Amino acid sequence: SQIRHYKWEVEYMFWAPNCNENIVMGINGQFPGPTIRANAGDSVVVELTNKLHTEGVVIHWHGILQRGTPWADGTASISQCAINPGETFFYNFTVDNPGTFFYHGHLGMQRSAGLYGSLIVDPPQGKKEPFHYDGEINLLLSDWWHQSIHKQEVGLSSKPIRWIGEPQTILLNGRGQFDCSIAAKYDSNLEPCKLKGSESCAPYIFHVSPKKTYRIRIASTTALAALNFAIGNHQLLVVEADGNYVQPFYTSDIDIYSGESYSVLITTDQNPSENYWVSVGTRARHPNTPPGLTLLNYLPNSVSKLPTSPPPQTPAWDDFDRSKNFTYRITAAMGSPKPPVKFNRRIFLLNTQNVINGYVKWAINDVSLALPPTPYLGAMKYNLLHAFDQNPPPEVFPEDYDIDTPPTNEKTRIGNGVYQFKIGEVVDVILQNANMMKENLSETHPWHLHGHDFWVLGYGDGKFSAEEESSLNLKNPPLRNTVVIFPYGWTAIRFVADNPGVWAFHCHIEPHLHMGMGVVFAEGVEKVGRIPTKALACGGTAKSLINNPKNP
Amino acid sequence: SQIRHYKWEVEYMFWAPNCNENIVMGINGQFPGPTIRANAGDSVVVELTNKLHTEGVVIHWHGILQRGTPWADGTASISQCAINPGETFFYNFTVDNPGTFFYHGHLGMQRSAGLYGSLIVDPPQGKKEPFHYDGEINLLLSDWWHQSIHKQEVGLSSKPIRWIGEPQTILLNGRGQFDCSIAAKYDSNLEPCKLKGSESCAPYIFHVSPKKTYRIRIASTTALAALNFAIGNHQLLVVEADGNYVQPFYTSDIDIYSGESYSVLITTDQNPSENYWVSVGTRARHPNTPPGLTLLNYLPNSVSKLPTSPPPQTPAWDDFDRSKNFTYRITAAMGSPKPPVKFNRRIFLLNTQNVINGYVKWAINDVSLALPPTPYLGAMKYNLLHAFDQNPPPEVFPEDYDIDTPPTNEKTRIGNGVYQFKIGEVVDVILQNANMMKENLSETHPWHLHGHDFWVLGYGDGKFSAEEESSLNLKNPPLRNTVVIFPYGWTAIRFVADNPGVWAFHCHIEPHLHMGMGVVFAEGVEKVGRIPTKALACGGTAKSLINNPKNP
Ligand SMILES: *[C@@H]1O[C@H](CO)[C@@H](O)[C@H](O)[C@H]1NC(C)=O
Ligand SMILES: *[C@@H]1O[C@H](CO)[C@@H](O)[C@H](O)[C@H]1NC(C)=O
Ligand SMILES: [Cu+2]
Ligand SMILES: [Cu+2]
Ligand SMILES: [Cu+2]
Ligand SMILES: [Cu+2]
Ligand SMILES: [Cu+2]
Ligand SMILES: [Cu+2]
Ligand SMILES: [Cu+2]
Ligand SMILES: [Cu+2]
Ligand SMILES: [Cu+2]
Ligand SMILES: [O-]
Ligand SMILES: [O-]
């Protein structure tokens, strides 16, 4: 086991992801950030210096469990106080298992500004992957707006709210094209991009040799878009989801929601004289963004040798039965950890879009989360009972609530209480979707849990009831860290509260988390060790711990 | 009989139709143009002064037959030379039958620039309409782009072609809204308009009293958009179409393609305590334009009092079965002229989208129309045989043509020949639609005939075959001047070549006309009287009528 050390600086910089200049948040002058790669069992040390002028910053390592290091999870106001301008903080954690992961900003909407990159973990040295491939291609998906993130944040907090709208561009490894298409030859209504291939927005080409097998790692840090990935003429064999192996299955395209990572295998068994299209299109929302496009370039064909076919047409955005068909087919690989069969706690979380005092907010069992200035982890370790609400938040919603109709907003409040578990509890969480404020509308929400993987026990339409208990999968359920709820449906997950610390469970669409769509879970904080002083130096924790008497 | 005399000047002016300023082509300082209202049998005298600086101008009176006066049709390079900067021209013509008509620009793409307005012809003096209503409402529909008409024209004449794209705003009597919605109340994601009611883009509100019946006259002069009209909680009785009366029927909404006009009656039955939504949305092309909206305000309710329901959602753009279900209902009112049972001429016109010398052109039986600098009517009256191509244009296409495949463009050319008819022939035209350059695309095209109304004999899917004869309606076919061809289908029309003159038959979508999609018919030209000198004053006709010898 090696210690992988990174020395990083976060600073804004002019950059043109889609060849239209804007500012991006870069790490050591790079957009996307540098890839961390390590082998399971290695320690990763990141010393991060904040070189933003007035903003604090944190980095969250999505999919890493932070077992023994809950302070290093990178969540402002939950695991730590944000890092101030000109300061250096050390994130020191172990990577326990192989998988496609990534990192992103977790303070305000900084991740939408560009703060993200890959974190890949290979098997322990000497050990190998359960499947063979010759090469690897790594792909990070994100979306991009030409409006400022600070204008987006202010607009989401105004009365009337100003929605951010559909992204202008889908970024594949940091690059995308706006107002022109690299596939304009198939339709004279499209404007041709004039690109020599050297530009910042020039496509990241996938170069493959004929008759080989490649693992394509795909992760999504989109702020809003749900995307569908497809390669012309090539089948994809799904072998990994969220750092865990799934029972393999072929598919023509995959759906991928913000927070998810997959590994797909392909084989370059097609006609070697041509190149093929890779298309990443928007689904689950009415599309207003052109697809992200690149080439699967079979070497030695020139990359300017365009495919004979158009890019694969994206599946219809609203065919949620097609979406469920893909999603329900995901099961744990043969030999994986099976869930505990009985639970100790089951919580029901109703997901609504509400209006709290003129403002459109999202709420979970009528509580829209407002995060405190004192980090929950420090505050619970030092038993600071005034830093946030001690009253247990609701574990059920009313059985007379009608999920087919808009909310009345009668009791909807803002809060910051924490659900508390005893170390060792088996917890089931039933997520229930419902109609939004507009009549006859409900959307998909990807939910992500920090510091744990969970088994996805099942999905269903309408309101969950006791009739549905027998449908829950306890044999084969996949272990994931992100899961979707479909329009008007429910999703059930189970996990064991065995990781000391304070962990959020929230929708991974960034405007939704900004509008309060999340809850905070805490377990065994009595067993948490020493927290770095920089993670404690703000709020109530700096107040109680800085000895500065008066008269003494 | 009465002479209506209009004194008119056309001049560009600054105007903001959707509250974004641009230049509009106004008549007598107003946009849209003044309404002409007369009784059938009157003579309209319009003396037009061209106050544009470097551009010529012409006005076409859509739907008026120009019986006796082919020179006043207002088609540059067909009926007349364009009127020069600083010159006045008189258009004198009789309005023969009552209806809802309109006028628009017919030189370059000048009508897209705002040159249009209403022409309503009432019944002969003393006579009454065949139906009762207590009031009438006049609506003219158009669409609006923010780019210049001349940057659009250069874009469509360029290699590679720069397509104009979907409109930014649908206009309802010259007003529409951009980037905000007057119906934002039903959806948080929309931006409210900050309108007082006084602005240039404030909606023309329809004021009605309860328990009455009104005739809403609706005409379309859009350059591109096919629209759908619907009023919340009000069924429509279709009673007139293209100046002629149809067999009445009820419908919840109508489709209207460019160049058509309708009259619909409604009764204000619904609850008098509220206002209802009028909604005009895009159909037939994938929409990227917000609906044109206004209120049916039931007096004395305040106009700030919104309806309790959202605007009616427009029917799906591509439900062509739904479209045909409406279109195929229209039949002539009993008492109307029945067609000649036998025809003397049948022509087959294949509509394709081609690439001629790198330019994307539209063509009819592989000839893309390019108009000559000499006006056809002048050319043919003076028998100037070198002024255009005297060879007959193609009257049939290859029966071995695959209408499901892109064209090859092998023999596609540009030309300017004319189909000539003997005065009195019963001419049959079958318009055949086909696949465009993009694989698997065929669009609707509104075709309009000048100087005539035709009977719409039938419509069919696929290629017309002679075995199709028994479906053609010779019993009740409607009299129209504009008709659509649906994707991959044919439409058959019949008319009588009884009006001395040169007349066009073209696709009424303004870009397609700019790209060559139309034909020119001429009949009985030796029966045309004296043409106005200004109409003759250009090209070959000026050259051969100006006596200017040399040495003298
Ligand atoms: C993190 O690792 C660095 C380098 O080994 C060490 O100096 C620092 O004290 C460590 N801090 C924590 C909280 O482990
Ligand atoms: C048109 O009518 C006006 C008014 O009667 C007359 O002065 C003008 O000469 C007429 N011109 C034509 C071409 O008929
Ligand atoms: Cu994340
Ligand atoms: Cu995470
Ligand atoms: Cu759409
Ligand atoms: Cu969400
Ligand atoms: Cu998070
Ligand atoms: Cu016309
Ligand atoms: Cu017209
Ligand atoms: Cu057309
Ligand atoms: Cu015309
Ligand atoms: O995470
Ligand atoms: O016309």
From Swiss-Prot, chains A, B:
Annotated binding of Cu cation 4, by residue: 445, 507, 512, 517
Q: Which SUPFAM superfamilies match?
A: Cupredoxins
Recorded hits in InterPro entries, A to Z, give: Cu-oxidase-like_N, Cu-oxidase_2nd, Cu-oxidase_C, Cu-oxidase_fam, Cu_oxidase_CS, Cu_oxidase_Cu_BS, Cupredoxin, CuRO_1_AAO
Query: Quick check: keyword Secreted in the entry?
Result: yes
**Residues reported to bind Cu cation 3:** 106, 450, 506
Catalysed reaction(s) here are: 4 L-ascorbate + O2 = 4 monodehydro-L-ascorbate radical + 2 H2O
Where does the UniProt entry place glycosylation sites?
92, 325, 440
Q: Where does Cu cation 1 bind?
A: 60, 448
Q: What are the TM regions of this chain, as residue ranges?
A: none
Could you say which residues bind Cu cation 2 here? 62, 104, 508
Please state the Enzyme Commission number of this protein: 1.10.3.3
One Gene Ontology cellular component term attached to this UniProt record is: extracellular region
Q: Which UniProt keywords apply?
A: Copper, Disulfide bond, Glycoprotein, Metal-binding, Oxidoreductase, Repeat, Secreted
Enzyme class label: oxidoreductase
| Compartment(s) of residence | Secreted
Intrachain disulfide bonds: 19-201, 81-538, 180-193
Belongs to which family? Belongs to the multicopper oxidase family.
| Its job | May be involved in a redox system involving ascorbic acid.
Protein's name in the database: L-ascorbate oxidase
